[PDB]
Amino acid sequence: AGILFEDIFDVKDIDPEGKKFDRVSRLHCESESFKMDLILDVNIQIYPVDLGDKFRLVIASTLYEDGTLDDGEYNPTDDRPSRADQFEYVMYGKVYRIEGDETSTEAATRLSAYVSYGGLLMRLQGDANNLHGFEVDSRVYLLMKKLAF
Amino acid sequence: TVINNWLLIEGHTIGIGDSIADSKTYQDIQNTIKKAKQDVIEVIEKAHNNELEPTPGNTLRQTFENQVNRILNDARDKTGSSAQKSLSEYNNFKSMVVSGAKGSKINISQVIAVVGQQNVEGKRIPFGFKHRTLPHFIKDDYGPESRGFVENSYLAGLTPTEFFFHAMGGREGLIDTAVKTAETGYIQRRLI
Amino acid sequence: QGIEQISKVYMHLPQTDNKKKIIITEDGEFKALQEWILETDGVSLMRV
Amino acid sequence: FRLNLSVTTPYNADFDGDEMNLHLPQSLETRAEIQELAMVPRMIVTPQ
Amino acid sequence: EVAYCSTYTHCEIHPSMILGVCASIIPFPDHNQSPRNTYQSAMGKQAMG
Amino acid sequence: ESDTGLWLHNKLGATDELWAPPSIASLLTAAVIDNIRLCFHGLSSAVKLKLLLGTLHLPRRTVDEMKGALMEIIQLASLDSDPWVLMVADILKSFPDTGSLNLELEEQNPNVQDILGELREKVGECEASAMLPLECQYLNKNALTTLAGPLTPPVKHFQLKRKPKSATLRAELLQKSTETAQQ
Amino acid sequence: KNVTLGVPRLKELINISKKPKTPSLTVFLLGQSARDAERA
Amino acid sequence: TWRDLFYKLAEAHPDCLMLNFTVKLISDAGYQGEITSVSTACQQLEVFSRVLRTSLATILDGGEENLEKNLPEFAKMVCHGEHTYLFAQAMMSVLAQEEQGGSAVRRIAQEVQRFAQEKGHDASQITLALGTAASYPRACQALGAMLSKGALNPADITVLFKMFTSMDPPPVELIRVPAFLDLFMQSLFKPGARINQDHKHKYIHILAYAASVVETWKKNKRVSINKDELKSTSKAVETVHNLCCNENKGASELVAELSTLYQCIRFPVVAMGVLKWVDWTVSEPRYFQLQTDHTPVHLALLDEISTCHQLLHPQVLQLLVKLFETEHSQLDVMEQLELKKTLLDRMVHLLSRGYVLPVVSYIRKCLEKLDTDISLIRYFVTEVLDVIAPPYTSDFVQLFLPILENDSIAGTIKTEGEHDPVTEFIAHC
Amino acid sequence: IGDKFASRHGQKGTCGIQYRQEDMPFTCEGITPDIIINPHAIPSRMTIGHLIECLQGKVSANKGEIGDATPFNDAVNVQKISNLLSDYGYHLRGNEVLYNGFTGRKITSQIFIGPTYYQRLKHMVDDKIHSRARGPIQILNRQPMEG
Ligand SMILES: [Mg+2]
């Protein structure tokens, strides 16, 4: 499958420090089941979002259901089944930092995975139990889909 | 190559629109200028009634000049800061400054806010005539515009007195270049 | 009073740590301290 | 004479009437010396 | 107005007459930096015409 | 809702903080508490305590509109084994009625009686030179006197032979200001 | 303050001359006199 | 030591039944204090109630001098949770119904409230739950709105003021909370937060009613109302705020109306307002550059505040120490020394009104530890000793002796001449 | 290219390259620049007079009358000039939307453009180009001549 993390979020806030850039918006979104915070940058111009919106967020290691682990070069002419068929907003980036509440002796209970989609940043901050598919310097898909509920 | 080809799409320019304030910043700049003028008038009044405490280490004239310079420089700095605050993210002066390609904060402040005090040999404009810089002023005038302070910006244009004072300020740069070249040439030759 | 060709002496407080008195404390920190200094306008260096 | 703009800084060139001199080395030894010591890509970092 | 002099003796004809021949062809000379006005006064004597 | 017990425990079960988690009012409504009431006996003490403490922060209109389920939750909190939940329910039971806290802590809380008694003894013992409330910085001398007694001047540690430079300075500045207003 | 930095200073340092424009001393106080202003 | 051994064993071996028996026997022997207490184990009912009671007794045995030290220690352990804070505030409200020294408990509760707000608590709703203000749901909800927002909303103030200045005013306890007045003067007398001259008069009336109005209460029931201080105080506040918030006015313009300024600053709430406005007006380091007088009239105003009112002494001292501890940039060294001399002169003026011990303690602390200039300290001591007379309080000498024991006593007598040196105080010790 | 041109505010420079009318950018109508100068020449030198003259050139050309730039006038300022310009269907600050010459696409940044007076200085490149390989020699010291 290649599903690293999946949950439902609802956007608690938009860019609080002011609109730094015209076409990109900061989203402070918060979870429902696993109770982990999310900081995301989205292209507001082509995928508009508003306050209170809920969406399904599915971080995946690959777009292909069989997990063939594509090389990572743009080949639009591909007829294979993909996850992006049932999602609206899809970005591809790589994870570049994992923090934690590690001590010198005990292990970590809270992690915070940082991923960059070519500039657009996302921090997923939650309990360490759900963040184990994230290894630094690995490619990751976003696969975000707004919910009508 | 790559950036120069993308600039064909993005483009870049600069014009009059990049030098205009939002007509609320102009009020702030005028208010700051009026405050500075009142302050220096007040200090000159105190010197008129002999209340200036001499600085322990400087002459009475020296402490007076230091006071006036401090007030004027603070006024120019405040006006410049307000001008930088007024700039939008679409402005071209700001883009060419923050990129470091050309220009600096003082250039924007002078173009928009105020040119500031002129100086020759590190001092205000000296009394070329008897006790006055120009015949248009009264004798023994140490006020801002009398001694070489430009209260206008390059957009609003300089009045004739401050135009002449700015010419005086600009001449020293060319003179200094013409002397410094020959002064440093011999230094470098001897070092070699 | 004074030494010859010492026209006047300025009393100064260095706000830069370069001329400040930096003394290593008992716990290893550096702890720059600000102390008065003097700047002459003449040179003796022998009686001074 | 036309030259890439990155090298306008070492020369302090201006493209507003500036003139520059070109010397042509005449021997194989001299050409090799220039190529191995004074080519532009070898002068990116200055010892100053 | 607020009394400053009240005892003038002479009045200027026009302040723009302080400029010379070469400098008086510059449009809006009071909006530039002075060295640029000097450079224009220099280069106006080399213009083709 | 769909297993609202886990939802409550995971939204609000921040056991590390004994404080009120943010937006506690927004997490509760008529239906939320209406579903909490029948599943109040499964959740932990920390989640229960956070819910009870946040029920205070709910707006007065919201409290009054759905006050019956609040009474039910408070009653079920009074039957809880944890003494803190008993105490919090005793305090909370007076909110739907009037709004002020239940002052009748005397029942089934001898520790409250002991602390009240010894605090009362210490307060009566130290009613002189007591800590005047910070509001005394503001209200007038008559208002201060009627509120928490008059102002007691600080003890005379010495005798002020002459005024400092402040008095002469203020007199001179008054004279200068009086002369300045005429120009 | 007035120290004449820049090219003239470099020329004085290079052209070793017994008559610098603005000679000076940077006197550091020794002990308790370093703190008190009057004792400076 | 063996008791701590047993406690750490029981921590390491919770399932050890004989360890539990040993803990039981330790509790039996009467040494229950050594088991985890204070802030470590305040989640238990009897333990928290006992430790809170002891800390409250410690505060009340503390006094004015212990206000700065023990109060944060108590506040960090009562606000560790909303349950402990709720118990603390409920007990404070229960005692506050009694005025036989209960003003101390009310003060402790108010300080706990402000510490909780500093930490991040939304404790204003808790405070409204404490007071009778919750009996008016509309006004209580509006107060909760303004205190969670932290701003003076004009519409909310109109809603509140509608209930006031009538035959049915809400209880003064609603309007007497320190947070309301503190935020009010932070928003009003500040050079920012411009008010469009429309609801500002309502703000002035609300402040006048909160501070200058006298309400008589017997058995926590409203008895009588005094409205003597509602016109003069309101006019004073309006005039003061107009002078302060017209920042385009020059210094000379404010100096011109010093007669009415001095008449108006003879009020406590006006004193706090003008003090805070001066605090904001001098906070900018640039202010001294535009200050073309070596001895400000602002300092004389602070002197007037200190002289007329004594309950405001800690605030003036805090401002003075804040100004003293900061190095001023873009000035002269001699100018900074003169400014320090003026600040120490203000310190001596504060010491004049009887507020002596904290100033001397801070002076000693800054001298012996983190040594500042000795000339300033000698000048401060010279000014202090020439304005005090024998006899002296034992504690006053107890704190004033160590400073004069060292640090260039020989230079303390240079050019005074007519009057005897500090040694006389030594003879009088 | 290589010849020297200067504005009336000391903005000298040499021709870098020449493009045909087809390649140069164009306005909504078929107006294409004769001279394109770099923006970076403006900020460090602060020749705001160049910008104001460019702005009032448009007003003078459209209205049909020679503009006035007397040094100390006070009847002429940037605001009035902009208000006059906005009456002829242009942006009041003198910007225009230019289309890329090669691709025909719009440029995301509106470009400042207007009529400005330029001069041709006598320092043409053909009068300066020089090269040598074993030419004439001096007589005293047999070294290559000067000039
Ligand atoms: Mg050049």
Q: Do residues H173 and F132 lie in contact, with contact meaning Cβ atoms separated by under 8 Å?
A: no
**Distance (Å, rounded) from C-alpha I109 to C-alpha F117?**
78
Q: Do residues I77 and B156 lie in contact, with contact meaning Cβ atoms separated by under 8 Å?
A: yes
Q: Do residues A119 and A106 lie in contact, with contact meaning Cβ atoms separated by under 8 Å?
A: no
**Distance (Å, rounded) from C-alpha H236 to C-alpha H213?**
15
Q: Annotated binding residue at D14?
A: yes
Q: By CA distance, what is G14's nearest residue in B?
A: B187
Q: By CA distance, what is F162's nearest residue in H?
A: H387
In which residue are the tokens 């701003």 written?
H151
- Does any CB of chain B come closer than 8 Å to the CB of residue G16? no
Amino acid, res. G15 = N
Chain B positions touching E35 (Cβ under 8 A) are 170, 173-174
**Distance (Å, rounded) from C-alpha H77 to C-alpha H112?**
10
Tokens found for residue E45: 């004597």
Backbone angles phi, psi at I144, to 5 degrees: -60, 140
**Distance (Å, rounded) from C-alpha F55 to C-alpha F72?**
12
Q: Which of A43, H337, F171 is nearest to G37 (CA)?
A: H337
Q: Which of H140, H135, H126, H71 is nearest to H104 (CA)?
A: H71
Q: Which of H188, H236, H189, H228 is nearest to H212 (CA)?
A: H228
- Is residue B54 classed as helix, strand or coil in its secondary structure? coil
Tokens found for residue E47: 């213009």
- Angstrom resolution of this structure: 3.3
In which residue are the tokens 């089944």 written?
A81
Tokens found for residue F40: 């109040």
Chain F positions touching H134 (Cβ under 8 A) are 60, 98-100
The alpha-carbon gap from G31 to the nearest alpha carbon of chain B, in Å, equals 24
Whether I43 and B19 lie within 8 Å, measured CB to CB: no
Please name the helix (run of DSSP H) or strand (run of DSSP E) that holds residue H334, with its range, or none: helix H333-352
Considering only the beta carbons, identify the residue of B35, B53, B74 that sits closest to H294: B53
What's the burial of H239, exposed, middle or buried (CB within 10 Å: 0-12/13-18/19+)? middle
Q: By CA distance, what is H333's nearest residue in C?
A: C13
For G27, how many CA atoms within 13 A lie in the half-sphere containing its CB? Answer: 22
Pairing assessment for the beta strands A138-141 and A92-100 based on DSSP bridges: antiparallel
> In the beta sheet, which residues pair with residue A127?
A110
Q: Annotated binding residue at D46?
A: no
Please say whether the dihedral angle defined by the alpha carbons of residues C14, C15, C17 and C20, taken in this order, is positive or negative. positive
**Distance (Å, rounded) from C-alpha B2 to C-alpha B8?**
10
Q: Do residues A79 and A136 lie in contact, with contact meaning Cβ atoms separated by under 8 Å?
A: no
Q: By CA distance, what is H327's nearest residue in C?
A: C15
Q: Do residues C25 and C31 lie in contact, with contact meaning Cβ atoms separated by under 8 Å?
A: yes
Q: Residue B116, by phi and psi: left (phi above 0), alpha (psi -120 to 50) or beta?
A: left
Give residue I13 CA to ligand 1 midpoint distance, Å.
9
The alpha-carbon gap from H19 to the nearest alpha carbon of chain F, in Å, equals 24
Whether A34 and F10 lie within 8 Å, measured CB to CB: yes
Measured in whole angstroms, how far is the alpha carbon of residue B2 from the centre of its chain? 40
Tokens found for residue H411: 């230079």
The alpha-carbon gap from D31 to the nearest alpha carbon of chain I, in Å, equals 17
Chain F positions touching H80 (Cβ under 8 A) are 18
Chain E positions touching B160 (Cβ under 8 A) are 15-16, 18
Residue H384: C-alpha distances to residues D47, H252, H380 (Å): 63, 32, 6
Q: How many residues does chain A have?
A: 149
Chain C positions touching G27 (Cβ under 8 A) are 9, 37-40, 48
**Distance (Å, rounded) from C-alpha H124 to C-alpha H130?**
10
Measured in whole angstroms, how far is the alpha carbon of residue H253 from the centre of its chain? 32
**Distance (Å, rounded) from C-alpha H15 to C-alpha F123?**
44
Q: By CA distance, what is G37's nearest residue in H?
A: H375
In which residue are the tokens 């100068």 written?
I37
**Distance (Å, rounded) from C-alpha B164 to C-alpha B156?**
16
Whether H107 and F132 lie within 8 Å, measured CB to CB: yes
Q: How many residues does chain G have?
A: 40
Pairing assessment for the beta strands B149-150 and B116-117 based on DSSP bridges: antiparallel
Chain G positions touching B191 (Cβ under 8 A) are 14
**Distance (Å, rounded) from C-alpha F138 to C-alpha F130?**
17
Please say whether the dihedral angle defined by the alpha carbons of residues I136, I138, I144 and I147, taken in this order, is positive or negative. negative
In which residue are the tokens 């405490």 written?
B53
DSSP summary character for residue A89: B
Chain H positions touching B49 (Cβ under 8 A) are none
The alpha-carbon gap from B130 to the nearest alpha carbon of chain I, in Å, equals 27
**Distance (Å, rounded) from C-alpha I106 to C-alpha I25?**
9
**Distance (Å, rounded) from C-alpha C18 to C-alpha C12?**
14
Q: Do residues F158 and H389 lie in contact, with contact meaning Cβ atoms separated by under 8 Å?
A: yes
Q: Which of I2, I39, I23 is nearest to I103 (CA)?
A: I23
- Is residue B73 classed as helix, strand or coil in its secondary structure? helix
Tokens found for residue I49: 């007079």
Q: Which residues contact I126 (CB under 8 A, 6 or more apart)?
A: I2
Amino acid, res. H177 = V
- Does any CB of chain B come closer than 8 Å to the CB of residue H289? yes
DSSP codes, I53-120:
HHHHHHHHHHHTS-----SS-SS--HHHHHHHHGGGTS-TTSEE-PBPTTT-PBPSS-EE------EE
Q: By CA distance, what is F14's nearest residue in A?
A: A35
Please name the helix (run of DSSP H) or strand (run of DSSP E) that holds residue A26, with its range, or none: strand A24-31
Q: How far apart are the first and last CA of chain D?
A: 28
Cβ atoms within 10 A of the Cβ of B145, count? 16
- Is residue B87 classed as helix, strand or coil in its secondary structure? coil
**Distance (Å, rounded) from C-alpha B65 to C-alpha B68?**
5
Residue A143: C-alpha distances to residues A2, A23, H333 (Å): 12, 19, 64
Q: Annotated binding residue at D25?
A: no
Chains C and F touch (3+ CB pairs under 8 A): no
Tokens found for residue A36: 């982990």
What's the burial of B80, exposed, middle or buried (CB within 10 Å: 0-12/13-18/19+)? buried
Q: Which of F23, F82, F51 is nearest to H82 (CA)?
A: F51
Whether H311 and F88 lie within 8 Å, measured CB to CB: no
**Distance (Å, rounded) from C-alpha H100 to C-alpha I86?**
79
Chains H and F touch (3+ CB pairs under 8 A): yes
Chains I and B touch (3+ CB pairs under 8 A): yes
Measured in whole angstroms, how far is the alpha carbon of residue F163 from the centre of its chain? 44
Pairing assessment for the beta strands I95-96 and I13-14 based on DSSP bridges: unpaired
Whether B70 and H330 lie within 8 Å, measured CB to CB: yes
**Distance (Å, rounded) from C-alpha H28 to C-alpha H38?**
20
CA dihedral H73, H77, H80, H84 (to 10 degrees): -140
Q: Which residues contact H359 (CB under 8 A, 6 or more apart)?
A: H317, H347, H350, H351
The alpha-carbon gap from C23 to the nearest alpha carbon of chain H, in Å, equals 13
- Domains, chain A, with CATH or none: 5-148 (2.40.50.140)
Please name the helix (run of DSSP H) or strand (run of DSSP E) that holds residue H5, with its range, or none: helix H2-12
Residues B155, B156, B158: CA angle, nearest 5 degrees: 105
Amino acid, res. F20 = A
Q: Which of B28, B33, B39 is nearest to B84 (CA)?
A: B28
The alpha-carbon gap from G32 to the nearest alpha carbon of chain B, in Å, equals 23
Please name the helix (run of DSSP H) or strand (run of DSSP E) that holds residue A10, with its range, or none: strand A3-14
The alpha-carbon gap from F97 to the nearest alpha carbon of chain H, in Å, equals 10
3-state DSSP of chain F: CCCHHHHHHHHHCCCCCECCCCCCCCCCCHHHHHHHHHHCCCCCHHHHHHHHHHHHHCCHHHHHHCHHHHHHHHHHHHCCCCHHHHHHHHHHCCCCCCCCCCCCCCCCCHHHHHHHHHHHHHHHHCCCCCCCCHHHHCCCHHHHHHHHCCCCCCCCCCCCCCCCHHHHHHHHHHHHHHHHCCC
Question: Taking every pair of C-alpha atoms in chain C, what is the biggest distance, in angstroms?
Answer: 45
Please name the helix (run of DSSP H) or strand (run of DSSP E) that holds residue I4, with its range, or none: strand I4-6
Residue F128: C-alpha distances to residues E17, G28, H100, H104, H110 (Å): 86, 56, 10, 10, 19
Interface test with E, best of B107, B163, B166, B175 (most E CBs within 10 A): B163
Give residue E45 CA to ligand 1 midpoint distance, Å.
19
Q: Do residues G39 and G32 lie in contact, with contact meaning Cβ atoms separated by under 8 Å?
A: yes
Please say whether the dihedral angle defined by the alpha carbons of residues H299, H305, H308 and H314, taken in this order, is positive or negative. negative
Pairing assessment for the beta strands I4-6 and I119-120 based on DSSP bridges: antiparallel
In which residue are the tokens 């921090």 written?
A123
Whether H411 and G39 lie within 8 Å, measured CB to CB: yes
Q: Which residues contact H144 (CB under 8 A, 6 or more apart)?
A: F59, H124, H125, H128
**Distance (Å, rounded) from C-alpha I44 to C-alpha F49?**
66
Chains D and I touch (3+ CB pairs under 8 A): yes
Considering only the beta carbons, identify the residue of C11, C35, C39 that sits closest to G25: C39
**Distance (Å, rounded) from C-alpha A15 to C-alpha A23?**
12
Please say whether the dihedral angle defined by the alpha carbons of residues A114, A115, A121 and A125, taken in this order, is positive or negative. negative
Helix, strand, coil shares of chain E as percentages rounded to 5?
45, 0, 55
Whether C42 and G23 lie within 8 Å, measured CB to CB: yes
In which residue are the tokens 């007694």 written?
F149
In which residue are the tokens 């010859």 written?
C4
Q: Do residues H134 and F102 lie in contact, with contact meaning Cβ atoms separated by under 8 Å?
A: no
Interface of A with F (CB under 8 A): 32-35
Give residue D44 CA to ligand 1 midpoint distance, Å.
22
Q: Do residues E27 and I119 lie in contact, with contact meaning Cβ atoms separated by under 8 Å?
A: no
Q: Do residues H152 and H183 lie in contact, with contact meaning Cβ atoms separated by under 8 Å?
A: yes
The alpha-carbon gap from H333 to the nearest alpha carbon of chain C, in Å, equals 7
Interface test with H, best of G1, G35, G39 (most H CBs within 10 A): G35
Residue H405: C-alpha distances to residues H371, H412, H426, H429, I62 (Å): 15, 12, 9, 12, 89
Q: Do residues H270 and H291 lie in contact, with contact meaning Cβ atoms separated by under 8 Å?
A: no
Q: By CA distance, what is B157's nearest residue in I?
A: I72
Measured in whole angstroms, how far is the alpha carbon of residue B61 from the centre of its chain? 22
- Does any CB of chain E come closer than 8 Å to the CB of residue B148? no
